[PDB]
């Protein structure tokens, strides 16, 4: 068996959007990459915005599922330990799935009104990790200048800024990420230890 | 007197690139906004990539100059104090120059080979602040797990991630930045105090 036509199209989309970005990618080129009549993208996806949106939901629901597995198991850990170990796993995923990684980072090139739609539709699923951190922070010996709110904000921006930075620095260059991996991992351990120390009593 | 034709074109460019981004902006629309024959953009700028590159160099040399003024004067300060106070000043600049701000943040939408060119050509001028931080970090009581290198890396990513985040969150919405200013400033003070504490003895 081969992929269904819709999955052949999502795969080509993930590859061409990640290679060219949203504006430069053409649906003809995605159709030719998927080995389907040009017509078939209209049939399944309506327009180029919708193809992009469904491919982002499709890749991100794969991630969300990796995440719930990790959550379900590592729930009882110290949150900083939880984060370092989650970041390592994301690094490893990005290196083993470079096309997906390159595609995820394109969210920034798109018109504000497609990125906004995506962020609305992702909010519920991003909120699972977010709501988990918030709860764990109550088990935290914090410091009389550091609100739980600043602590939550600093940690989330750390966690999602880090991701953005490496996806961009290593875009198209998986072997270099694999070469820098355990240096990156080690830098991350120390940076979370700086936050923990600066944040707590 | 009015602006020179080249400055009328750079101003329109800054506005249309910041409004539409690099790919969607047309040079015809910039010419019409600048009130110049369509031909005149070719005459001064050659192509759309070159217009974009010269407008980024033009806005960024304005910034660099603000920066050297601040540097020249605040050179003797504690680096964390120096940074908080520099970030406040950048916030205030962004609120009073929203079109420039919106334009700077578009650097990410452009083809890798135009952003790369820009980063090469900016490296020398970004390195002034970078080389200053590096030096001040030697006057720092650091902690036996924190290399000057991780400390430099954490601080620079803090400083330039913060910027990216607010330019994006407040894109097109200057009144909201002005409304959130002194809350943002206060969050920043506390986050740099977390870094200082986590980073030092």
| Residue-wise DSSP of A123-134 | HHHHHHHHHHHH
How far apart are the C-alpha atoms of B180 and A128, rounded to whole Å? 27
Compute the radius of gyration of chain A from its Cα atoms.
Answer: 19
Token digits of residue A93: 């995923």
Reduced to 3 states, what is the DSSP secondary structure of residue A40? helix
Q: How many CA atoms lie within 13 A of B87 on its CB side?
A: 29
The residue written with tokens 């969210």 in the block is A107
In Å, how far from its chain's centre is CA B185? 17
**In degrees, to the nearest 5, what angle opens at C-alpha B182 toward C-alphas B179 and B187?**
120
Q: Is A93 on the interface with B (CB under 8 A)?
A: no
In Å, how far from its chain's centre is CA A84? 16
CB contacts of B191 in chain A (<8 Å) are 150, 154
Domains of chain B in start order, with CATH, are 1-47 (1.10.10.60), 48-201 (1.10.357.10)
**A6 and A44 in contact (C-beta within 8 Å)?**
yes
Burial of B182 (0-12, 13-18, 19+ CB in 10 A): exposed
In angstroms, the separation between the Cα of residue B160 and the nearest Cα of chain A is 10
DSSP B135-153: HHGGGS-B-TT--HHHHHH
Query: To the nearest 10°, the Cα dihedral for A152, B93, A111, A14?
Result: -60
Nearest CA in chain A to B171: A112
Total Cβ atoms within 10 A of residue A149: 11
**Inter-chain residue contact B150 with A197, CB threshold 8 Å:** no
Distances from the Cα of A65 to the Cα of A52, A119, A129, B72, B167, angstroms: 20, 18, 12, 52, 32
Query: To the nearest 10°, the Cα dihedral for A108, B187, B86, B96?
Result: 60
What resolution in angstrom units was achieved for this structure? 2.3
**A83 and A70 in contact (C-beta within 8 Å)?**
no
Task: Give, for B3, the enclosing helix (H) or strand (E).
Answer: none
Token digits of residue B103: 């334009």
DSSP A93-137: HHHH-HHHHHHHGGGGGS-HHHHHHHHHHHHHHHHHHHHHHHHHG
What is the DSSP secondary structure assignment for residue A2, as one 8-state letter? -
- Disruptive mutation site among A141, A194, A200 for chain B (greatest number of B CBs within 10 Å): A194
Angle (deg, nearest 10), helices B174-199 and A148-169: 90
Strand partners, B200: B142
Q: Which residues contact B83 (CB under 8 A, 6 or more apart)?
A: B155, B159, B192
Nearest CA in chain A to B105: A108
**A53 and A45 in contact (C-beta within 8 Å)?**
no
**B34 and B11 in contact (C-beta within 8 Å)?**
yes
Supply φ then ψ for residue B199, to 5 degrees: -90, -30
CB contacts of A193 in chain B (<8 Å) are 145, 198
Token digits of residue A109: 């090139």
Q: Is A150 on the interface with B (CB under 8 A)?
A: yes
């Amino acid at each position: 068996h081969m992929l269904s036509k819709r999955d052949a199209i999502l795969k080509a989309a993930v590859e061409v959007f990640g290679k060219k970005g949203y504006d430069r990618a053409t649906t003809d080129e995605i159709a030719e990459k998927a080995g389907v009549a040009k017509g078939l993208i209209f049939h399944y996806f309506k327009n180029k915005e919708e193809l992009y949106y469904q491919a982002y939901m499709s890749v991100t629901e794969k991630l969300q599922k990796e995440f719930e597995n990790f959550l379900m198991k590592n729930r009882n850990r110290d949150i900083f330990d939880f984060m370092e170990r989650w970041i390592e796993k994301k690094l490893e995923y990005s290196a083993s799935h470079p096309e997906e990684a390159d595609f995820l980072i394109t969210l920034v090139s798109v018109d504000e009104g497609l990125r906004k739609r995506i962020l609305l539709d992702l909010e519920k699923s991003q909120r699972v990790f977010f709501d988990f951190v918030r709860e764990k922070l109550k088990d935290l010996d914090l410091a009389e200048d550091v609100t739980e709110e600043i602590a939550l904000k600093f940690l989330m921006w750390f966690f999602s800024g880090f991701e953005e930075v490496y996806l961009r620095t290593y875009q198209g260059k998986p072997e270099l990420l694999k070469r820098d991996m355990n240096t990156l991992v080690e830098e991350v351990k120390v940076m979370l230890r700086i936050l923990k120390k600066g944040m707590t009593k």
